Amino acid sequence: GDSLSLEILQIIKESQQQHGLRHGDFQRYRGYCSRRQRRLRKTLNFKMGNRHKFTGKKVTEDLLTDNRYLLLVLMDAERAWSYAMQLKQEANTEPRKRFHLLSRLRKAVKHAEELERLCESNRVDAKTKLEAQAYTAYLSGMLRFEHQEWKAAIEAFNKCKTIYEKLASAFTEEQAVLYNQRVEEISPNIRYCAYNIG
Amino acid sequence: DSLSLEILQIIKESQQQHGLRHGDFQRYRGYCSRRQRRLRKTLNFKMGNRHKFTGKKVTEDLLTDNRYLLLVLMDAERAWSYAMQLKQEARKRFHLLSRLRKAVKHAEELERLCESNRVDAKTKLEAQAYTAYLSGMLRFEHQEWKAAIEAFNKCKTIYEKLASAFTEEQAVLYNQRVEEISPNIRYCAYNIG
């Protein structure tokens, strides 16, 4: 039970709401993630160098004695995704921005995949493994949706739904709210995919 | 469920990265202030919206997460850093004692907050141990030897208990804090006689 934990959905939702997404300011949110990531990098560099005064031994043996490296990768994902969503706003009128949109969205999935694999570590708790898999499925669905790959998108969104519903069942109705609203959040996407496979 | 605040791990990693260990006391204060400002904004944002319907049954408050506790911890650390700077910049003794007493009062606030049933057992002990350590330091610098040894002994007992309760890995931090105050305890004892 001294496992690592990362409350991924809680972290991203609370961050997104405070730092710009109340009014679709994805540029503001990306800025925030970037500043957080920089603080995290400096801390990781310090911890990986830190040594005990008496014995001279390293204080922190690897990147997984706390959740900070996991959080650094999550910021990379969130930064790429917010950049993609900014570009989507711009591409509405500037079609030339679509390449850059698609590149950033794929980048977000890639970072989520990296985070998910890190969470497969036996030091990471079971709830976080579910969180990381659900996050990757969400972003995979978003990338597939933007490419109009409707069946692959609905597979990803349905996987996301199934995992969050699993999560919500292991908890009280008060704890489950965030997971349930996340399912509500992707339901318009699931609807749209289903009718394109009609 | 319960709130957790790993007080000793936070203060040691923070003092080490942000200046205090190599005598850049003002840099450490700045870091505490900047962290506080970020915590204040998050807390204001949360509390500012708490009257909105979002599907929850419970209304958020300052003990919904540990951010308010961490805010108070940073006050005690800023006061401690001023005290440490003065200890080095060595009437000025009165200012030293004043800064130490302020750090103690902040720690006492954090300890009272942690009396809440929202806060876990481990965190209550960490808070008690932190207050005891700062109280010991105040009394020690004022040559109140018996009172200093009482506080340091309480501090040592609690950290030994925490060292003895978890992983061999977590024990190292707590054991090192016990090492740190052992010379103070010896000095008190030989003044008492």
Domain of B128: which CATH number?
1.10.3450.40
Identify the CA nearest to B21 among candidates B80, B68, B62. Answer: B80
Q: What is the DSSP letter of A123?
A: T
Identify the CA nearest to B76 among candidates B57, B38, B103. Answer: B103
Beta bridge partners of B139: none
Angle at A168 between CA A164 and CA A173, to 5 degrees: 145
- Domains held by chain A: number: 1
Following DSSP, what letter does each residue of chain B receive, concatenated?
--B---HHHHHHHHHHHSSGGGT-HHHHHHHHHHHHHHHHHHHHHHHHTTTS-SS-SSPP-TTSSSHHHHHHHHHHHHHHHHHHHHHH---HHHHHHHHHHHHHHHHHHHHHHTTSTTB-HHHHHHHHHHHHHHHHHHHHHTT-HHHHHHHHHHHHHHHHHHHTTS-HHHHHHHHHHHHHHHHHHHHHHHHH-
AA letter at A196: N
> CA distances (Å), A137 to each of A17, A133, B62, B129, in order?
21, 6, 33, 44
The residue range of the domain holding B179 is 1-193
Beta bridge partners of B24: none
A-to-B residue pairs, Cβ atoms closer than 8 angstroms: 29
CA-CA-CA-CA dihedral for B164, B165, B170, B172, to nearest 10:
-10
Question: Is A72:A115 a contact under the CB 8 Å cutoff?
Answer: no
CA–CA min distance A100, chain B (Å): 32
Q: Is B65 left (phi over 0), alpha (psi -120 to 50) or beta?
A: beta
Following DSSP, what letter does each residue of A125-186 receive, concatenated?
-HHHHHHHHHHHHHHHHHHHHHTT-HHHHHHHHHHHHHHHHHHHHSS-HHHHHHHHHHHHHH
The structure tokens 């996301």 sit at A160
Distance CA B7, CA B69 (A): 10
Residues 6+ apart with CB under 8 A from A163: A130, A133, A134, A137
Of A42, A50, A181, the CB nearest to B55: A181
Method: X-ray
Find the chain B residues whose C-beta atoms sit closer than 8 A to any C-beta of A.
13, 16-17, 41-42, 45-46, 54-58, 166-167, 169-170, 172, 176
Distance CA B174, CA B161 (A): 9
Identify the CA nearest to A19 among candidates A7, A6, A31. Answer: A31
The packing angle between helices A8-18 and A26-49, to 10°, is 130
Q: By CB neighbour count within 10 A (0-12 exposed, 13-18 middle, 19+ buried), where does A100 fall? A: middle
Angle at A10 between CA A7 and CA A14, to 5 degrees: 140
Identify the CA nearest to A2 among candidates A67, A47, A61. Answer: A67
Given an 8 Å threshold on Cβ–Cβ distance, is B55 in contact with A17?
Answer: no
> CA distances (Å), B37 to each of A21, B34, B42, B75, B97, in order?
21, 5, 9, 12, 27
> CA distances (Å), A89 to each of A86, A95, A99, B169, in order?
5, 10, 13, 49
Q: Is A60 left (phi over 0), alpha (psi -120 to 50) or beta?
A: beta
Beta bridge partners of B3: B119
Q: Strand runs (DSSP E) across B24-181, as ranges?
A: none
Interface test with A, best of B9, B17, B47 (most A CBs within 10 A): B17
Helix, strand, or coil here: B74? helix
Question: Is A157:A186 a contact under the CB 8 Å cutoff?
Answer: yes
Angle at A144 between CA A139 and CA A145, to 5 degrees: 95
AA letter at B92: K
> Would you give the end-to-end CA distance of chain B in angstroms?
48
Beta bridge partners of A58: A51
The packing angle between helices B25-48 and A8-18, to 10°, is 90
Tokens of A30: 């990306």
Element (H, E) at B165: none
Tokens of A129: 């493994």
Of B45, B166, B176, the CB nearest to A2: B166
Distance CA B146, CA B185 (A): 10
AA letter at B152: F
**After which residues does chain B become discontinuous at a C–N distance over 2.5 Å?**
90
Distance CA B160, CA B156 (A): 6
Helix, strand, or coil here: B162? helix
Cβ neighbours of B57 (radius 10 Å): 8
Question: Is B132:B151 a contact under the CB 8 Å cutoff?
Answer: yes
Backbone Cα Rg of chain A: 18
User: Which chain B residues touch A173 with a CB distance below 8 Å?
Assistant: 57
Backbone Cα Rg of chain B: 18
Tokens of A78: 């969130």
Q: Strand runs (DSSP E) across A2-49, as ranges?
A: none
